[PDB]
Amino acid sequence: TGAGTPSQGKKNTTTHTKCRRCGEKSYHTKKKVCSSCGFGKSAKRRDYEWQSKAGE
Amino acid sequence: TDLSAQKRLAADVLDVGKNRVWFNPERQGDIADAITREDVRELVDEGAIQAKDKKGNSRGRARERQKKRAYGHQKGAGSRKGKAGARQNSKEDWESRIRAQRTKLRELRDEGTLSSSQYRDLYDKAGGGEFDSVADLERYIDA
Amino acid sequence: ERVVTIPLRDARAEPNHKRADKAMILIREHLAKHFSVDEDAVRLDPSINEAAWARGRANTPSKIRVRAARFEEEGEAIVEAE
Amino acid sequence: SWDVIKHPHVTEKAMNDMDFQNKLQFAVDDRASKGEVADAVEEQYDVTVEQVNTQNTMDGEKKAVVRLSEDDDAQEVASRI
Amino acid sequence: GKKSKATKKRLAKLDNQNSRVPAWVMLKTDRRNHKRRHWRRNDTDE
RNA sequence: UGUCCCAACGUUGGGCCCGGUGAACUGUACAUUCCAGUGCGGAGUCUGGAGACACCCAGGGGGAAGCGAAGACCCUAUGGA
RNA sequence: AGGGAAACGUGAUUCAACCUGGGGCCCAUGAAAAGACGAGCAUAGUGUCCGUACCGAGAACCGACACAGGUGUCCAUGGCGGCGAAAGCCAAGGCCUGUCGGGAGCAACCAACGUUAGGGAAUUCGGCAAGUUAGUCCCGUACCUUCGGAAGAAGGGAUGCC
RNA sequence: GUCGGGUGAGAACCCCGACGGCCUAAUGGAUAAGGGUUCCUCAGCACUGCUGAUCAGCUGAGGGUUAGCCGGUCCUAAGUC
RNA sequence: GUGGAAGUCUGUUAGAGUUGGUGUCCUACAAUACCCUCUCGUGAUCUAUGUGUAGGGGUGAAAGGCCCAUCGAGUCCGGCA
RNA sequence: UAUGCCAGCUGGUGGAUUGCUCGGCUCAGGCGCUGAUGAAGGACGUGCCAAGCUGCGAUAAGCCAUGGGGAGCC
Ligand SMILES: [Cl-]
Ligand SMILES: [Cl-]
Ligand SMILES: [Mg+2]
Ligand SMILES: [Mg+2]
Ligand SMILES: [Mg+2]
Ligand SMILES: [Mg+2]
Ligand SMILES: [Mg+2]
Ligand SMILES: [Mg+2]
Ligand SMILES: [Mg+2]
Ligand SMILES: [Mg+2]
Ligand SMILES: [Mg+2]
Ligand SMILES: [Mg+2]
Ligand SMILES: [Mg+2]
Ligand SMILES: [Mg+2]
Ligand SMILES: [Mg+2]
Ligand SMILES: [Mg+2]
Ligand code: NA
Ligand code: NA
Ligand code: NA
Ligand code: NA
Ligand code: NA
Ligand code: NA
Ligand code: NA
Ligand code: NA
Ligand code: NA
Ligand code: NA
Ligand code: NA
Ligand SMILES: [Sr+2]
Ligand SMILES: [Sr+2]
Ligand SMILES: [Sr+2]
Ligand SMILES: [Sr+2]
Ligand SMILES: [Sr+2]
Ligand SMILES: [Sr+2]
Ligand SMILES: [Sr+2]
Ligand SMILES: [Sr+2]
Ligand SMILES: [Sr+2]
Ligand SMILES: [Sr+2]
Ligand SMILES: [Sr+2]
Ligand SMILES: [Sr+2]
Ligand SMILES: [Sr+2]
Ligand SMILES: [Sr+2]
Ligand SMILES: [Sr+2]
Ligand SMILES: [Sr+2]
Ligand SMILES: [Sr+2]
Ligand SMILES: [Sr+2]
Ligand SMILES: [Sr+2]
Ligand SMILES: [Sr+2]
Ligand SMILES: [Sr+2]
Ligand SMILES: [Sr+2]
Ligand SMILES: [Sr+2]
Ligand SMILES: [Sr+2]
Ligand SMILES: [Sr+2]
Ligand SMILES: [Sr+2]
Ligand SMILES: [Sr+2]
Ligand SMILES: [Sr+2]
């Protein structure tokens, strides 16, 4: 069984969903954590300096 | 004219598979005007829409064959496919035999012909597979 | 109008699982020729259709007697079994 | 403050319910309960509500099918709006 | 699947948005919905 | 026992012709070549001869050191893992 | 009551479901909790909130596609067949959308495949490929063996219909 | 698939009948996930559809999912916060 | 004779797998597909869903296998021009 | 003279060029905190017809007062 096309047919699990806090489809319904804004993980909003060029 | 929708409604009103409903060739125009289930029932009573009959497989050839086999024919070596134990379950056959032999022995006892002790000796022999059948048992009882 | 005998052996040139189809073509071509009319103007009564497909799509009869009439302002023919 | 009854739901299916089952159909606030729908209707048209069936629609609204008592006539009630 | 009431509201909105730009807007602006979606060719969120 | 001697005939789908639909690979230029030679020693294009009226259809692929991949082998880098 | 144009059956066999027992196995021991029963009856009232369409696949899902792939459950008792939930044929039901057609005894060549005299592995690294054998019953069965096996060894005979 | 016929400006492939076929653990019936209106009706053929199209999962416009007793909702499992 | 054990045998039952053809395909139906043959099919079995283990870390009946077409150290962005 | 070569002509295709600028880029001066009295952000609504943007919030492209403004506006 190839890792490619044939293995793609087994994918019918819902993980990432519309996030209550930020509105992005990043709320992982299994972990109950938003990979985009951090909801469910932290009160503070998920943010990182590497999201932009260092001097900008 | 396109009557596929009507075909679906007719199948439901006639309670039959769609492939069995017949629409009169000369009335496509009227049927095409049929919108409601009521319009369909109407055309059904007129006979413009009817249900073709479903077939059932004939069993005549099977019956003759069944008779031959019930009489013991058509079961020679060349007509068998399964193993012997598959054609007749052996444990099942032993259950048939042993039960027949025990019923026999039980009737002879209550009837008086056999004393509990004679009955016992025969019952344990039967259980040990001493008799091929009831007749075999009777023939034995007669010394 | 007259009765004609159509030979269908040329249907053997077509693959065997489709002889019936070819037969219906040879019939239209034979009539159109012999009644001097366009193939588009030849009408085959379903009776002829059932005759050629009697034994299924792969078994056409070697010949077939057909009764055809010729007429009208544009010139056309109508055929059927016999 | 949100109201209960939004507006009459007028469609062929609604008309039939009104002509054959003495039922009225309404678009109502999706937060309204079957009971709150019953009250609102009795207090807006002065009639007797017998049963209420609801459905959250694919249009984002809640639809209510309100059956009136035999003492009332849906056809006439709806005819005054 | 099984849709919650909120999921339903969102699907409903997406359906509504998926409509043509009214004819009169054409005239008024003297001459296209860029958010037109197809159930099959596209994929909504969630 | 068609693997072979040794190949034959046949069947179905293609292939071929017609309607419709309709891509891609590839393209420095020129280009009808062949035999020799020459040249960075493995040339359709240089030299000498030979041959060569233009275009088109089908074919099996001899050549374009054919197309497809900045050689995997080998070495080199005061390269990496 | 309903349903049926009508009749609007009766017995039987084999018996999925479902019910209830007996036996055997473990250096393996085969959930928990809410709840229910225990604990009667009449009448009346209340029972809100959310889901509910459709596809479920050789076009509705995932695979960039209306993709020959992938993707769970139940229908496991429709008829003949036979050991059979096997083959083959046929119902109920579904379909002609595993979606471009027209024409040429329709050439070469290719993919799948049928039949080949005599020789019979000479072919090839190699019997690769293809073929040979075949179901069931009876007879019969070697070396060897950890005594289980080897074994369907091998070899021989039978097989329809009435 | 074929012969007739229906509709239409237009019909090999949209519909009717007949004849001929295909599918039987599936090409039939009910569904889980997932999709999200793809469901039904009317009107359409510029787009989408391996050709055509009057057809459609396509385009325009409307319509459709009704529960004390079917799920959820309640309980706790591995385990999570 | 009974009994009915077995990481027991046959078996395209379901289901799981893949020895050979070095067949077909190789701008594919398909970025691992198709056909025939072949192996397993009461158990160290197969399978759905839920759930846990995370990057010098997992997971591994061990092939440097697998951890979303990527693994002798995933992916994303940043360091970074 | 067919297939065809080179250059041009008329017409396409294409969107270079020229001209234009409701957008950028950079500099300078001013100014500078918000939130449990629920912010910032998001979701969903809200229009006669309304898909997108903007505004607004069930009083939903808006309500009230004062000053400005003015014969138009939506
Ligand atoms: Cl017992
Ligand atoms: Cl449900
Ligand atoms: Mg229509
Ligand atoms: Mg036994
Ligand atoms: Mg055939
Ligand atoms: Mg409800
Ligand atoms: Mg709509
Ligand atoms: Mg080469
Ligand atoms: Mg290199
Ligand atoms: Mg090396
Ligand atoms: Mg190193
Ligand atoms: Mg297809
Ligand atoms: Mg021979
Ligand atoms: Mg040799
Ligand atoms: Mg072999
Ligand atoms: Mg699992
Ligand atoms: Na409304
Ligand atoms: Na989709
Ligand atoms: Na041969
Ligand atoms: Na060549
Ligand atoms: Na049977
Ligand atoms: Na077609
Ligand atoms: Na024993
Ligand atoms: Na293999
Ligand atoms: Na790493
Ligand atoms: Na400031
Ligand atoms: Na708008
Ligand atoms: Sr494996
Ligand atoms: Sr596969
Ligand atoms: Sr899955
Ligand atoms: Sr947390
Ligand atoms: Sr931060
Ligand atoms: Sr709607
Ligand atoms: Sr898709
Ligand atoms: Sr060629
Ligand atoms: Sr029984
Ligand atoms: Sr349903
Ligand atoms: Sr499939
Ligand atoms: Sr049938
Ligand atoms: Sr088509
Ligand atoms: Sr012969
Ligand atoms: Sr040999
Ligand atoms: Sr040899
Ligand atoms: Sr033998
Ligand atoms: Sr099915
Ligand atoms: Sr047209
Ligand atoms: Sr439809
Ligand atoms: Sr076994
Ligand atoms: Sr087996
Ligand atoms: Sr190989
Ligand atoms: Sr082969
Ligand atoms: Sr390959
Ligand atoms: Sr068994
Ligand atoms: Sr991978
Ligand atoms: Sr960088």
Swiss-Prot record, chain A:
The keyword Iron does not apply. One of its GO terms (biological process) is translation. Binds 1 zinc ion per subunit. GO terms for cellular component: cytosolic large ribosomal subunit. Residues 1-16 have a biased composition (Polar residues). Zn(2+) binds at residues 19, 22, 34, 37. It holds the Pfam family Ribosomal_L37e. A zinc finger (C4-type) spans 19-37. Signal peptide: none annotated. The keyword NAD does not apply. One of its GO terms (molecular function) is structural constituent of ribosome. SUPFAM superfamilies: Zn-binding ribosomal proteins. Coiled coil: none annotated. Its cofactor is Zn(2+). It comes from the Archaea. Keywords: Metal-binding, Ribonucleoprotein, Ribosomal protein, RNA-binding, rRNA-binding, Zinc, Zinc-finger. Part of the 50S ribosomal subunit. Interacts weakly with protein L4. This is Large ribosomal subunit protein eL37. It comes from Haloarcula marismortui (strain ATCC 43049 / DSM 3752 / JCM 8966 / VKM B-1809).
Curated annotation (Swiss-Prot), chain C:
GO terms for biological process: cytoplasmic translation. GO terms for cellular component: cytosolic large ribosomal subunit. Keywords: Acetylation, Ribonucleoprotein, Ribosomal protein, RNA-binding, rRNA-binding. Binds to the 23S rRNA. Located at the polypeptide exit tunnel on the outside of the subunit. The keyword Iron-sulfur does not apply. It comes from the Archaea. The keyword rRNA-binding applies. Pfam families: Ribosomal_L31e. GO terms for molecular function: rRNA binding; structural constituent of ribosome. PROSITE patterns: RIBOSOMAL_L31E (PS01144). Part of the 50S ribosomal subunit. This is Large ribosomal subunit protein eL31. Belongs to the eukaryotic ribosomal protein eL31 family.
Swiss-Prot record, chain D:
One of its GO terms (molecular function) is structural constituent of ribosome. Binds to a specific region on the 23S rRNA. Located at the polypeptide exit tunnel on the outside of the subunit. Coiled coil: none annotated. Keywords: Ribonucleoprotein, Ribosomal protein, RNA-binding, rRNA-binding. InterPro entries: Nucleotide-bd_a/b_plait_sf, Ribosomal_uL23, Ribosomal_uL23-like, Ribosomal_uL23/eL15/eS24_sf, Ribosomal_uL23_CS. This is Large ribosomal subunit protein uL23. Part of the 50S ribosomal subunit. Interacts with protein L29 and weakly with protein L39e. It holds the Pfam family Ribosomal_L23. Belongs to the universal ribosomal protein uL23 family. SUPFAM superfamilies: Ribosomal proteins S24e, L23 and L15e (SSF54189). Gene3D superfamilies: 3.30.70.330. The keyword Repressor does not apply.
UniProtKB/Swiss-Prot annotation, chain E:
GO terms for cellular component: ribonucleoprotein complex; ribosome. It comes from the Archaea. Gene3D superfamilies: Ribosomal protein L39e (1.10.1620.10). Pfam families: Ribosomal_L39. The keyword Ribosomal protein applies. GO terms for biological process: translation. Keywords: Ribonucleoprotein, Ribosomal protein, RNA-binding, rRNA-binding. One of its GO terms (molecular function) is rRNA binding. Transmembrane segments: none annotated. Part of the 50S ribosomal subunit. Interacts weakly with protein L23. Binds to the 23S rRNA. Forms part of the polypeptide exit tunnel. Belongs to the eukaryotic ribosomal protein eL39 family. This is Large ribosomal subunit protein eL39.
